[PDB]
Amino acid sequence: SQIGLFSKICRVTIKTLHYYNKIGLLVPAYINPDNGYRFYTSDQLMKFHQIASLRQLGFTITEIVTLTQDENSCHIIERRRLEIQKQIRDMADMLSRINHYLQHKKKERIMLYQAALKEIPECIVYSKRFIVPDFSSYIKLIPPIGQEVMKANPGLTLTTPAYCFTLYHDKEYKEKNMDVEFCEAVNDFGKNEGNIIFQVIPAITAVTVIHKGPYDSLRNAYIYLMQWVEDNGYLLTNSPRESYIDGIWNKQDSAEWMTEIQFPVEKV
Amino acid sequence: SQIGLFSKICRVTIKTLHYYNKIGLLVPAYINPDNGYRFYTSDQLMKFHQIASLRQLGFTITEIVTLTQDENSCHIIERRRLEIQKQIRDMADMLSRINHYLQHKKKERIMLYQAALKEIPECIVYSKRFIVPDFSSYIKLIPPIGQEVMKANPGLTLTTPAYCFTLYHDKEYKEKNMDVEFCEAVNDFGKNEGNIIFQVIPAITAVTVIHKGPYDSLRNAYIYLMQWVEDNGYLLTNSPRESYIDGIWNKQDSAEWMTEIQFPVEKV
Ligand code: 118
Numbered sequence: 074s075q076i077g078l079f080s081k082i083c084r085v086t087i088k089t090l091h092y093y094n095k096i097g098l099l100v101p102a103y104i105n106p107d108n109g110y111r112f113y114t115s116d117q118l119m120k121f122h123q124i125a126s127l128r129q130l131g132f133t134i135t136e137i138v139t140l141t142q143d144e145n146s147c148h149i150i151e152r153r154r155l156e157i158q159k160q161i162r163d164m165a166d167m168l169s170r171i172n173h174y175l176q177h178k179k180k181e182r183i184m185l186y187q188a189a190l191k192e193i194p195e196c197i198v199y200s201k202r203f204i205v206p207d208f209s210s211y212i213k214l215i216p217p218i219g220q221e222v223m224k225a226n227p228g229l230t231l232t233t234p235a236y237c238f239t240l241y242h243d244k245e246y247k248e249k250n251m252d253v254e255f256c257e258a259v260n261d262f263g264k265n266e267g268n269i270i271f272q273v274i275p276a277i278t279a280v281t282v283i284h285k286g287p288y289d290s291l292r293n294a295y296i297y298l299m300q301w302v303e304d305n306g307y308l309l310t311n312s313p314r315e316s317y318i319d320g321i322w323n324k325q326d327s328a329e330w331m332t333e334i335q336f337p338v339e340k341v
Numbered sequence: 342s343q344i345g346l347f348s349k350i351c352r353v354t355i356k357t358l359h360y361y362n363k364i365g366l367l368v369p370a371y372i373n374p375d376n377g378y379r380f381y382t383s384d385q386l387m388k389f390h391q392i393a394s395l396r397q398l399g400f401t402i403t404e405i406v407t408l409t410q411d412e413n414s415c416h417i418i419e420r421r422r423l424e425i426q427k428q429i430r431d432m433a434d435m436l437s438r439i440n441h442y443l444q445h446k447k448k449e450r451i452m453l454y455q456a457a458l459k460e461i462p463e464c465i466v467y468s469k470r471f472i473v474p475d476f477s478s479y480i481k482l483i484p485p486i487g488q489e490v491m492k493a494n495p496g497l498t499l500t501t502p503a504y505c506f507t508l509y510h511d512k513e514y515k516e517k518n519m520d521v522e523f524c525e526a527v528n529d530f531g532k533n534e535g536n537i538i539f540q541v542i543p544a545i546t547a548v549t550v551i552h553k554g555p556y557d558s559l560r561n562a563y564i565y566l567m568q569w570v571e572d573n574g575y576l577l578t579n580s581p582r583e584s585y586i587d588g589i590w591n592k593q594d595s596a597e598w599m600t601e602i603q604f605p606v607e608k609v
Pocket residue numbers: 212215216218219220235237257317318320322
């Protein structure tokens with residue numbers, strides 16, 4: 074039968090048959106060489122049935138071409154079986170995050186905090202860990218650590234980009250008497266002097282939020298993320314990090330300082 | 342900051358930044374007039390965080406653009422929540438159906454039937470209802486059924502292609518008796534007489550397989566489909582159909598005949 078009628082019996086378009094004949098799939102029965110027409114037989118219906126059945130299961134064209142001729146090979150099906158489960162879990166997570174987005178946006182008219190997942194690699198740092206009574210004494214006592222360590226460690230170069238952060242080792246969020254550690258990243262090791270130490274922090278996967286403005290409201294950021302981990306069925310696994318990007322060392326308007334809070338979490 | 346350092350602050354490729362500048366999504370702070378170099382600032386990172394945050398919910402570039410610059414436009418988010426809720430369902434069928442596939446393939450290491458879902462539009466048919474004692478007698482009795490109808494009507498033109506079939510109105514099969522109907526599709530209505538009548542048959546969505554060979558193995562097809570609609574969670578809403586494509590009237594070898602088995606189903 075000619076191609077315009079075969080396309081109505083099969084209920085598909087003609088461009089589909091042209092494309093199939095081009096790629097080497099469902100080659101016609103008899104092509105007339107003078108005019109160039111294509112004539113199909115009832116033998117082609119029983120292969121198109123198989124093509125449409127395999128395509129309705131999500132397979133791509135090259136696997137179907139490799140399948141109809143290498144019929145012993147059946148592991149492509151499992152290769153697809155793992156990707157389907159991955160797709161179900163990702164769509165089931167995007168759905169929950171969209172619902173959380175709408176639930177959060179219900180009462181608040183606009184939103185400040187926008188969470189995002191990311192990867193953080195391994196690093197070498199020099200660090201110092203101690204207890205502080207408050208945050209203001211902390212802000213003033215950091216820079217002595219920076220002048221002093223360069224005094225005792227000659228020629229120590231930082232990394233690119235710069236990574237300078239602090240760890241809140243306490244299990245519960247507090248306002249005074251905080252156990253805190255300060256870390257800055259360098260390229261190579263050195264030797265310890267007094268309380269200043271050198272160590273290696275492993276690689277993590279973390280959820281991040283960026284806060285912009287004055288320090289006093291940073292707890293608000295810590296509110297949102299503390300909601301986030303509970304709302305979308307996640308579990309906080311390790312101590313949070315607070316890494317400093319823009320502060321008093323580059324600018325004078327303290328209402329333009331920007332920092333980023335990262336909670337290492339896992340989908341369990 | 343130059344493009345190569347900013348690409349390491351954000352952990353993204355350079356071609357992505359070029360593309361985002363071309364689209365109009367993320368425009369650099371300052372561009373050199375003669376070189377053409379691109380320089381970025383911290384607020385570019387605050388915005389890239391928002392871009393990635395929006396991109397993690399599955400939106401495409403145009404909606405992300407429309408979301409960032411324009412008004413809130415909440416109707417786009419819930420409208421997405423349907424495209425996910427639907428998609429999961431779609432996904433949730435296929436992981437089932439492929440799981441059907443394996444439970445049959447690994448039983449025989451050969452596949453005789455492959456099922457596929459399709460849609461059959463509405464038609465105008467002539468039809469005759471009756472009870473049959475034995476299928477062979479029905480085959481023998483069909484040529485007179487053709488003869489009465491062929492003589493007494495002017496301008497009785499069949500369809501292109503030819504759709505002639507038999508309707509099985511029984512719920513649970515038995516070899517003793519069968520309430521069947523013979524149907525052949527025509528273009529227009531007219532007057533009815535005798536045991537034959539004209540009627541319209543509405544469109545349906547059916548699962549079909551194609552059987553080639555004699556009829557004395559046809560039950561082996563049904564036992565397959567009676568499983569396929571039961572395991573993978575679909576529901577049989579109406580009487581099956583048996584459509585005849587190629588037989589003694591076009592061919593000579595009965596082992597090269599070809600028929601099509603159709604089960605009308607819905608998603609339940
Ligand atoms: C060791 C200890 C502190 C700093 Sb810094 C800083 C500098 C550049 C970029 C990011 C951070 C600092 C502040 C004032 C004067 C000199 C250095 C610093 C201080 C307090 C809180 C966060 C960072 C550096 C090394």
